[PDB]
Design a protein around this ligand. Structure first.
Ligand SMILES: Nc1nc2c(ncn2[C@@H]2O[C@H](COP(=O)(O)OP(=O)(O)O)[C@@H](O)[C@H]2O)c(=O)[nH]1
Ligand SMILES: Nc1nc2c(ncn2[C@@H]2O[C@H](COP(=O)(O)OP(=O)(O)O)[C@@H](O)[C@H]2O)c(=O)[nH]1
Lengths: 301, 301
């Protein structure tokens, strides 16, 4: 009934999707293996969606923007899924799907859930965010960064480096007392994006203003998301980026499988503090501690 | 004579350093092991130096700045080593040491060379730079980024993300027709550093101007390097950063040892293109290709 579970998802049965999602989220050894066979069957029905990541600090307005962008999209004929690596009026619609979420684990489960959703007819996948930003950037076509409409304080609370992940930057809460400040805060971020992408010819991250609580700027945000994709498609980079993500994910799964044998080893985990204390104190070289970790892992595996 | 090779390096014998460096750079299995024992003996004589990384695009002026900074330091009583991951007038001095350089390999060899040099009495280590910037940032106390004194073009050619590695940013070639442009180019970079470190309280990367060919700005660069260190020491972060680098390096060596069994496997390497082509075409899931890579590695090891 895995062959059966695949025709039901592809045919649009909507009690079968939660179950296939449950199967994909399971890690019991018997489940991963059928989860794999299902994905394999549904994979050629995937890929026909725009995957958008969305990040920014708690309270920047992420879930308010997603709810509104979700409504905007549904009213335009899309079927929208929201995943997390809050929004009630979205969740009511028969054309929306909202599901709540170890980074390797949740990445795997999210990634595999996307294949299911795309096979199931969803054409827009919104994925909301520790090292979780990179993980989501690596599984989406357009990575969106929401920031604060405060001149000199846009990236408050943002891990450094995250700005370079963004295909689009959005100065949110451009309302109330900060209509004019929003514009200046945006122009400040543009200036910086211009220094970080000084001779980019294909896509330099545009910076938008938004008021996700007043529903202002979501349409323009989406117009920009579509534009990102027409630009990348016209240069052959859109499929090229996806194929490169799937190859990097493959090598990452290989990396995780082979390193978890070590990291996950109980003996390695008891002895870890002491070998580290010794390294930090220069009582032991890192090559020698590394060897000891390996010998020990190898004795108890 | 490994116990002998350690008292000769620590005592300041200067034909013994090249030889210990040669021993540390060797990967023949019999050599790594004595290299380790030597490092272990010299490790308590290391740590008494300021390690500075230096990066920027080819032609930005790196090796001209290093030669001049080197002379500045030697005339002030330091013993200076330069490593690379060009400068002849430096290389003549009995208080300078210049040595030319697989990323894991060259990182290991550089890192181990630093211990030797510090044991040998060198108190300033300059390390000049693919993913080589992160590697050097992870092995130094102060990471310096040289950029161009061109308004709107400072980071031309720089991999994105590298700006967030810098403890210090230096607008170089602030001479000739660009004295005033240099000042503005610097103020542009300050504005961006201010957006990326909007509420930093301990150390916000200062941005300096320099003319490394006219010997202008090197002294101020070094004053800033020393200041970086007094600031970090006053907060207990200077040793804390070093100890965290040695622990991360340990886990990296463990990661490299365990993954090279796979990556380095000849059979894995023949079959790689085809498994990738299959992943990129959606003929195969990444979890299933990952498994096939592992089974195959495991059959031929
Ligand atoms: N003034 C203003 N408040 C907003 C805006 N968007 C969200 N908020 C408020 O900020 C708080 C957090 O918003 P939320 O969507 O939950 O942010 P999240 O943590 O990123 O999901 C809520 O009280 C929202 O009403 C906006 O555009 N303007
Ligand atoms: N005008 C000017 N030229 C410089 C400066 N520093 C280096 N150069 C020139 O730029 C070229 C490359 O300098 P170099 O030190 O080799 O750069 P590197 O590739 O980063 O090592 C040489 O012709 C230098 O003379 C400077 O401050 N001003």
């Amino acid at each position: 009934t895995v062959d059966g579970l695949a025709t039901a998802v592809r045919g649009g049965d909507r009690a079968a999707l939660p179950r296939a999602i449950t199967l994909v989220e399971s890690t019991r050894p018997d489940h991963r293996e059928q989860a794999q066979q299902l994905l394999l069957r549904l994979l050629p029905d995937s890929g026909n969606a725009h995957r958008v990541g969305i990040t920014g600090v708690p309270g920047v307005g992420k879930s308010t923007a997603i709810e509104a962008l979700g409504m905007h999209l549904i009213e335009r004929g899309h079927r929208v899924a929201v995943l997390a690596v809050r929004m009630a009026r979205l969740a009511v619609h028969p054309n929306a799907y909202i599901r709540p979420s170890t980074l390797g684990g949740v990445t795997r489960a999210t990634r595999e859930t996307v294949v299911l959703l795309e096979a199931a007819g969803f054409d827009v996948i919104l994925i909301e965010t520790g090292q979780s930003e990179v993980a989501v950037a690596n599984m989406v076509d357009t990575f969106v960064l929401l920031t604060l409409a405060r001149t000199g304080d846009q990236l408050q609370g943002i891990k450094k480096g995250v700005l370079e992940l963004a295909d689009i930057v959005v100065v949110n809460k451009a309302d109330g007392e900060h209509h004019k400040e929003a514009r200046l805060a945006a122009r400040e971020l543009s200036a910086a994006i211009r220094l970080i992408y000084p001779r980019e010819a294909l896509w330099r991250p545009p910076v938008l203003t938004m008021s996700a609580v007043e529903g202002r700027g979501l349409a323009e945000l989406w117009d920009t998301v579509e534009r990102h994709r027409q630009v990348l498609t016209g240069a052959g980079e859109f499929d090229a980026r996806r194929r490169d993500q799937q190859v990097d994910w493959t090598w990452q799964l290989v990396r995780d499988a082979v390193l978890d044998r070590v990291w996950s080893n109980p003996t390695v985990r008891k002895v870890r503090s002491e070998l580290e204390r010794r390294v930090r104190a220069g009582e032991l070289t890192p090559a020698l501690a590394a060897q000891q970790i390996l010998e020990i892992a190898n004795l108890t595996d």
